[PDB]
C-alpha cells in the first residue's frame, strides 16, 4: 500500500537550517505531484509548497517562496524540503502529501508527520 | 497607479487588479464594497465599484479574489447566495492536480485551465490535457500513456507478474507481488498460511482434515495438479508444449531479473537480480515459469493431457486415493486413456486458482 | 474555535455495516465542505470521501466507491459516514475533517477520530 515516511524534524535555533525527507513507496512516484503542508500549534493546516512529477515546476507559498526549496529524486522515490533561515512562526508538524487524480481533493495521502520547533 | 474609487496612491502590487475590468482597487475599498453588496444588496449588485462591469463565469474569477480579501463569514454568504440565487446547487469546485489550486469551474468544455498554473486538464480523470485525449475516453487515454511510458515497458514482464496480485483467501488483502520460487505465503494481517498458487491452506501439525494424508504431523498443503507448486518442477520446454498444443502464445524475448521482491529491513523493495537466461523473456527461471503457469491457469489448460502412464498412476493415487490396476486385454494406450478419462471427470482443476 | 467529535467506532465482523457520526461546532456548518480521512495501522492519513456544503456532490476514494456513503444534516451540524461490506483493509482510525477552499488544503482541521477494526 501507499506509505509516506517523513524524517528530519527537531529543535533548531532561529536562523539555522533543516532538511526534511519523505520516503515514498507503493505507487509510481514519478507520476504524481508531491507537496509539503504544515500545522502550527493551535492553528489550521497550511500549504507550504508543491512540486511537479518530474520536477520542472515548483510552487511555493508567499511566506516561504524564497526561504524554502522543494525537490525530489525519482530514482530514490523520496521528496525533499530544504528549510533555510527558520523563523519562530515555522514551528509546526510537517506532512508530505501525494497528489491525486481523483475528483474531490488535490491530495489523497498524507504521512505521519515530523515535529519541528524553533527556539 | 492609484485606486480607482478613493484615489489612494499605491504601487501596483499593493492593490488588487480586477481580472474582468483591470480597474485597480485598494484592499479596504475592495473589501467594504463587496460585503455591503452581500449584506444589504443582492447578488446582482456584486458589480465592480469603479467601472460598469450573459456569461456569468465572472463569479468564478471573482471568487478567487473574494476568498483573499474578505472575512470568512462574508465569504460564506457569497457561497450561500451563489447557490440560493444563481446555481440552485453548490458550485463545482475543481482542484488542480499539478499545483493544488482550488477554483470554481462551471463551463461547457471537458478541458479546464487552472487559473494559477495555466495548465489544462480533463475534468473527469484530472490528468494533463493532450491532443490524444480529444475524442477518447479517459480509460483509453491513460492506457495510451501507460503504453508510451518508457520506464514502464523497460520493466518488461515484471509488471505483468505484479499486476496479478496475491489475494489472501480469508482476509482478502491484496499484495501486488509476484509468487516467486516458493509457494508458502504468510499474510501479515490475518496470520493465514496458504499457497500463493492454489490458495489452499498450509495446515499446521495435526490440523490437516484431508483423508488418507500421510504427513499430518508436518506443515504442508494440498495442491491441485495444475498449481504452480507442481508445475514449477516442469521444464520450461514442457510448460511451453502445453501452451503450443492449445495455440496459446508466450514470450521468449524481452519485449538481473527486475521482478520486484520485498527486502527485510528494520520491508524494502528489492529486485530479484537472479540470472536471466536466454529464451526466458529477460526474467528469472522461477519467475519465467510463474509467467508460463499463469498463462496455463488463465486458459484452464489441463496438464494431465501430457501425463504418461506413471504420472497418471501417481495422480490417481493422490486425488482419487485408489492404486490403479490395468485390466486384462488393455494395451498402454488404453490403460493410459482410461486413467486420464477418470481423472478429468472426477477431479476438476484448481477451484481457487486465479485465472 | 473549530471543534469536531467523532463517534460510532467499534469492532465489526467482516462484511458487516457501520455508521459513523461527527458533531461540529465553532463555525458555520453550511458554508464548508466536510470530509472523512482515516489512519491505517502504521500509516498517516488516507482521504476517504468529501461532501459539498449542501450535499450536491459526493466524492469517494476508489477503494470505497459503492461501499461507503457520505451524508450530512446541516440542520444539526452533523456529518455521517455509512460503511457497508467492511473488509480487513478498512481497519483504521476515521477522522472527521472540516473542509477549506484555500490552496493545497482541502481541509484545515480534523478531529480526534474513532477507531474501527474488522475482525479476521
Ligand atoms: C518455500 C521455501 C523453500 O525453502 C522451498 C523452495 F524455495 C522451493 C522448493 C521446491 C521447488 N521445487 N520443489 C520444491 C521447496 C522448498 F521447501 C517453502 C517454504 C515453506 C515454509 C515452511 N515453513 N515456513 C516458515 C516456510 C513451505 C513450503 C515451501 C514450498 O514448497 O514452496
Ligand atoms: Cl500507480
Ligand atoms: Cl476535483
Ligand atoms: Zn480605495
Ligand atoms: Zn472596474
Ligand atoms: Zn494549477
Ligand atoms: Zn480524462
Ligand atoms: Zn489475510
Ligand atoms: Zn498450491
Ligand atoms: Zn494433509
Ligand atoms: Zn526473478
Amino acid at each position: 500500500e501507499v506509505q509516506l515516511l517523513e524524517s528530519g524534524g527537531g529543535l533548531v535555533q532561529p536562523g539555522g537550517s533543516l532538511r526534511l525527507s519523505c520516503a515514498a513507496s507503493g505507487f509510481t512516484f514519478r507520476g504524481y505531484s508531491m507537496a509539503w503542508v504544515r500545522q502550527a500549534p493551535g492553528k489550521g493546516l497550511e500549504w507550504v509548497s508543491t512540486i511537479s512529477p518530474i520536477g520542472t515546476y515548483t510552487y511555493y507559498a508567499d511566506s516561504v517562496k524564497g526561504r524554502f526549496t522543494i525537490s525530489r529524486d525519482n530514482s530514490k522515490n523520496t521528496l525533499y524540503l530544504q528549510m533555510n533561515s527558520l523563523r519562530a512562526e515555522d514551528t509546526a508538524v510537517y506532512y508530505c502529501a501525494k497528489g491525486s487524480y481523483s475528483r474531490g481533493t488535490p491530495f489523497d495521502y498524507w504521512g505521519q508527520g515530523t515535529l519541528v520547533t524553533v527556539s | 497607479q492609484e485606486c480607482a474609487v478613493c484615489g489612494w496612491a499605491l504601487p501596483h502590487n499593493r492593490m488588487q487588479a480586477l481580472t474582468s475590468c483591470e480597474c485597480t482597487i485598494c484592499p479596504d475599498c475592495f473589501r467594504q464594497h463587496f460585503t455591503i453588496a452581500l449584506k444589504e444588496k443582492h447578488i446582482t449588485d456584486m458589480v465592480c465599484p469603479a467601472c460598469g462591469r450573459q456569461l456569468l463565469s465572472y463569479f468564478s474569477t471573482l471568487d478567487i479574489q473574494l476568498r483573499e480579501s474578505l472575512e470568512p463569514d462574508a465569504y460564506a454568504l457569497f457561497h450561500k447566495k451563489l447557490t440560493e440565487g444563481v446555481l440552485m446547487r453548490d458550485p463545482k469546485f475543481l482542484w488542480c492536480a499539478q499545483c493544488s489550486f482550488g477554483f470554481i469551474y462551471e463551463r461547457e468544455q471537458l478541458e479546464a485551465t487552472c487559473p494559477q498554473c495555466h495548465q489544462t486538464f480533463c475534468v473527469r480523470c484530472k490528468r494533463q490535457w493532450e491532443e490524444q485525449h480529444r475524442g477518447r475516453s479517459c480509460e483509453d487515454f491513460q492506457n495510451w500513456k501507460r503504453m508510451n511510458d518508457p520506464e514502464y515497458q523497460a520493466q518488461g514482464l515484471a509488471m505483468y507478474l505484479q499486476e496479478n496480485g496475491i489475494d489472501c483467501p480469508k482476509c482478502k488483502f491484496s499484495y501486488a507481488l509476484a509468487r516467486g520460487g516458493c509457494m508458502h505465503f504468510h499474510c501479515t494481517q490475518c496470520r493465514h498460511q496458504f499457497c500463493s498458487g492454489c490458495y489452499n491452506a498450509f495446515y499446521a501439525k495435526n490440523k490437516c482434515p484431508e483423508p488418507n494424508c500421510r504427513v499430518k504431523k508436518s506443515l504442508h498443503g494440498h495442491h491441485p495438479r495444475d498449481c504452480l507448486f507442481y508445475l514449477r518442477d516442469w521444464t520450461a520446454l514442457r510448460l511451453q508444449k502445453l501452451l503450443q498444443d492449445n495455440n496459446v502464445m508466450f514470450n521468449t524475448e524481452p519485449p538481473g531479473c527486475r521482478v520486484i521482491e520485498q527486502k527485510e529491513v528494520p520491508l524494502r523493495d528489492e529486485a530479484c537480480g537472479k540470472e536471466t537466461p536466454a529464451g526466458y523473456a529477460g526474467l528469472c527461471q522461477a519467475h519465467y515459469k510463474e509467467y508460463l503457469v499463469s498463462l496455463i491457469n488463465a486458459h484452464s489448460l489441463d496438464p494431465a493431457t501430457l501425463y504418461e502412464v506413471e504420472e497418471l498412476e501417481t495422480a490417481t493415487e493422490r486425488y482419487l486415493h485408489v492404486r490403479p490396476q490395468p485390466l486384462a486385454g488393455e494395451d498402454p494406450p488404453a490403460y493410459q486413456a482410461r486413467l486420464l478419462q477418470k481423472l478429468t471427470e472426477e477431479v476438476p482443476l484448481g477451484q481457487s486458482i486465479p485465472r
Side-chain angles (χ1 to χ4, degrees), chain A residues 1-10 12 14-64 66-119, chain B residues 2-13 15-38 40 42-52 54-67 69-70 72-80 82-110 112-126 128-130 132-144 148-150 152-162 164-188 190 192-204 206 208-213 215 217-257 259-273 275-309 311-322 324-355:
Chain A
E1 274 285 328
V2 171
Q3 173 74 309
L4 303 156
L5 240 187
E6 298 103 339
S7 62
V12 46
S17 266
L18 204 80
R19 196 179 89 112
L20 311 179
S21 291
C22 164
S25 93
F27 65 97
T28 319
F29 183 73
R30 70 179 194 276
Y32 296 87
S33 287
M34 305 297 293
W36 288 97
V37 296
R38 71 189 181 190
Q39 185 174 45
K43 289 152 73 80
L45 209 53
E46 176 191 359
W47 173 81
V48 175
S49 171
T50 297
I51 184 171
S52 88
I54 70 176
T56 77
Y57 304 119
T58 56
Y59 314 91
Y60 296 87
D62 292 330
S63 98
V64 301
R67 295 167 49 245
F68 291 179
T69 294
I70 188 166
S71 57
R72 58 192 295 161
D73 194 352
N74 293 344
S75 84
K76 297 287 196 305
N77 277 8
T78 171
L79 171 68
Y80 300 107
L81 180 67
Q82 180 65 54
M83 302 187 300
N84 305 332
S85 325
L86 301 104
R87 313 182 310 239
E89 290 87 330
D90 289 320
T91 292
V93 177
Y94 282 77
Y95 307 90
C96 60
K98 167 186 169 299
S100 74
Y101 292 119
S102 298
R103 265 151 319 162
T105 179
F107 311 119
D108 49 0
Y109 288 93
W110 297 259
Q112 303 183 249
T114 60
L115 185 286
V116 174
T117 317
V118 175
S119 163
Chain B
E2 59 204 29
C3 172
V5 307
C6 74
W8 192 13
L10 303 117
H12 189 277
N13 61 276
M15 320 196 40
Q16 281 275 20
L18 277 44
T19 302
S20 153
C21 44
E22 283 180 13
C23 302
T24 44
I25 308 301
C26 88
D28 308 293
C29 294
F30 181 92
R31 179 179 301 103
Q32 294 164 25
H33 159 65
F34 281 119
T35 79
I36 57 103
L38 288 164
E40 302 133 76
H42 290 167
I43 178 77
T44 59
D45 302 316
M46 304 216 71
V47 58
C48 159
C51 79
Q54 194 82 350
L55 202 293
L56 308 201
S57 91
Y58 152 84
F59 279 154
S60 325
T61 321
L62 185 71
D63 166 78
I64 302 309
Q65 274 178 336
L66 269 182
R67 184 168 63 239
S69 148
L70 214 73
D73 295 328
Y75 191 49
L77 209 163
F78 169 68
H79 281 317
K80 192 171 188 295
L82 184 60
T83 78
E84 289 200 25
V86 186
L87 293 163
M88 325 316 304
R89 49 150 183 81
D90 274 331
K92 285 150 213 247
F93 206 68
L94 285 187
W95 294 95
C96 178
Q98 291 251 335
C99 87
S100 323
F101 183 80
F103 61 100
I104 300 181
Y105 179 77
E106 294 270 353
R107 283 184 179 85
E108 186 99 37
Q109 310 83 237
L110 172 133
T113 321
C114 178
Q116 176 75 53
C117 79
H118 310 302
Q119 303 176 255
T120 58
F121 60 91
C122 166
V123 291
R124 259 209 59 175
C125 63
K126 289 177 59 200
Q128 258 209 127
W129 182 251
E130 300 183 17
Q132 172 80 7
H133 198 341
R134 216 173 278 109
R136 291 187 178 86
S137 66
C138 312
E139 201 196 350
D140 256 20
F141 179 62
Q142 89 160 5
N143 291 197
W144 175 81
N148 279 63
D149 199 330
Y152 178 71
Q153 282 105 330
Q155 292 295 99
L157 290 179
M159 300 296 104
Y160 165 77
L161 292 172
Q162 294 161 206
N164 313 337
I166 302 180
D167 312 317
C168 182
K170 313 274 211 233
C171 94
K172 322 133 213 182
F173 196 94
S174 196
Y175 300 93
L177 319 165
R179 285 130 177 86
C182 174
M183 308 309 300
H184 184 264
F185 197 93
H186 193 94
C187 179
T188 78
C190 68
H192 193 51
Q193 310 199 21
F194 61 94
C195 177
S196 62
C198 70
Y199 289 154
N200 287 325
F202 264 89
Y203 297 104
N206 306 283
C208 178
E210 311 285 340
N212 313 103
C213 172
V215 289
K217 302 181 187 176
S218 318
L219 198 280
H220 72 290
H222 290 268
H223 317 255
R225 69 186 181 271
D226 63 322
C227 171
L228 177 56
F229 180 86
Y230 288 120
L231 296 189
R232 66 182 172 177
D233 293 331
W234 283 28
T235 187
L237 183 68
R238 204 195 187 194
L239 289 172
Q240 287 163 346
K241 198 235 282 188
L242 184 63
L243 295 161
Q244 290 161 346
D245 293 335
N246 293 271
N247 267 27
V248 176
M249 304 296 107
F250 48 88
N251 267 86
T252 45
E253 64 293 299
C257 181
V259 170
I260 298 284
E261 287 186 334
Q262 280 203 314
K263 172 78 229 97
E264 175 57 332
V265 293
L267 272 291
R268 194 182 306 276
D269 281 338
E270 178 134 5
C272 185
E275 197 134 303
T276 63
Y280 282 4
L283 292 179
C284 178
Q285 189 196 18
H287 284 140
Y288 183 67
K289 290 188 180 182
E290 174 183 341
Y291 158 72
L292 297 184
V293 167
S294 71
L295 296 177
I296 292 175
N297 293 338
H299 300 83
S300 299
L301 305 189
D302 195 352
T305 53
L306 301 183
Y307 282 179
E308 299 216 320
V309 170
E311 287 172 288
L312 281 161
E313 293 188 317
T314 296
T316 306
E317 294 177 283
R318 177 172 300 155
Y319 299 107
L320 293 177
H321 315 108
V322 167
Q325 202 169 267
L327 310 175
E330 277 183 327
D331 63 331
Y335 183 48
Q336 163 171 33
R338 174 168 57 86
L339 295 190
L340 174 62
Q341 198 206 46
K342 194 68 176 182
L343 182 69
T344 60
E345 279 166 27
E346 292 266 49
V347 177
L349 282 313
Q351 299 185 280
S352 324
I353 292 186
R355 310 185 178 274

